Structure 1
Amino acid sequence: SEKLPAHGCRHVAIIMDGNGRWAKKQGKIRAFGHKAGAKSVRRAVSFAANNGIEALTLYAFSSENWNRPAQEVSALMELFVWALDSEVKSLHRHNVRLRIIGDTSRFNSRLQERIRKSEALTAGNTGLTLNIAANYGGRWDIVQGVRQLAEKVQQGNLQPDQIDEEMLNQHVCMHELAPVDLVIRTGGEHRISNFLLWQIAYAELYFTDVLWPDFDEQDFEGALNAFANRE
Structure 2
Amino acid sequence: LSEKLPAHGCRHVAIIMAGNGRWAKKQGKIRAFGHKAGAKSVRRAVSFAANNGIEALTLYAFSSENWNRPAQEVSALMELFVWALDSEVKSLHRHNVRLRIIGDTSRFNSRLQERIRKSEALTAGNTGLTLNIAANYGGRWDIVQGVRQLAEKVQQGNLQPDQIDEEMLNQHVCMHELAPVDLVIRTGGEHRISNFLLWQIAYAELYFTDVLWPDFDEQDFEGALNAFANR
Give ranges in structure 1 of 5+ residues lacking alignment.
none
Q: Which residue is 2:29 aligned to?
A: 28
Tell me the TM-score normalized by structure 2: 0.99
The corresponding residue for 2:119 is 118
Alpha-carbon distance in structure 1 between the residues aligned to 2:137 and 2:85:
18
Once the two structures are superposed, what CA deviation does each residue of 1:120-163 show, in whole Å capped at 9, x if it has no partner? 00000000000000000000000000000000000000000000
> What's the RMSD between the two structures over aligned residues?
0.5
Deviations 1:160-209 (A, max 9, x none): 00000000000000000000000000000000000000000000000000
1:54-93 per-residue CA deviation (whole Å, 9 max, x = no partner) reads 0000000001110000000000000000011010000000
Give the conservation status (yes or no) of the 8 Å contact 1:92–1:121.
yes
Alignment partner, residue 143 of structure 1: 144
Distance 2:61 2:118 in 1: 19
Contact 1:59 1:134 in 2 (8 A): yes
| Superposed displacement of residue 5, structure 1 | 2.3
Kindly report which structure 2 residues correspond to 1:74-223, keeping only aligned pairs within 5 A, or say none.
74-223=75-224
* Superposition deviation, residue 222 in structure 1: 0.4
Q: Determine if contact 2:19/2:213 at 8 Å carries over to the other structure.
A: yes
Q: Is the 8 A contact 1:37 1:212 kept in 2?
A: yes
1:6 deviates by 3.8
Which range is displaced more, 141-150 or 1-10?
1-10
Q: How far apart are the structure 2 equivalents of 1:140 and 1:207?
A: 24
User: What is the TM-score of this pair, normalised by structure 1?
Assistant: 0.99
Q: Secondary structure at the match of 1:183?
A: strand
Q: 2:64: which partner in 1? A: 63
Aligned counterparts of 2:7 and 2:121: Cα–Cα separation in 1: 29
Which residues of structure 2 form unaligned runs of 5+? none
Cα deviation for residue 17 of structure 1 reads 0.2
Is this contact kept in 2: 1:14–1:183, CA < 8 A? yes
Quick one: distance in 2 between partners of 1:229 and 1:66? 38
- Number of corresponding residues: 230
SS in 1 for 2:211: coil
- Is 1-10 or 201-210 further displaced after alignment? 1-10
Quote the Cα distance in structure 1 between the aligned partners of 2:149 and 2:67: 25
Instruction: Judge conservation of contact 2:7–2:228 (CA < 8 Å) in 1.
Output: no
How far residue 8 of structure 1 moved from its aligned partner, in angstroms, is: 2.0
Q: CA deviation at 1:4?
A: 1.2
Q: Which moved more, 1:86-95 or 1:2-11?
A: 2-11
Secondary structure of the equivalent of 2:57?
strand
Contact 1:138 1:198 in 2 (8 A): yes
Q: 2:7 and 2:106 mapped to 1: Cα distance?
A: 36
Distance (Å, rounded) in 2 between the aligned partners of 1:199 and 1:162: 21
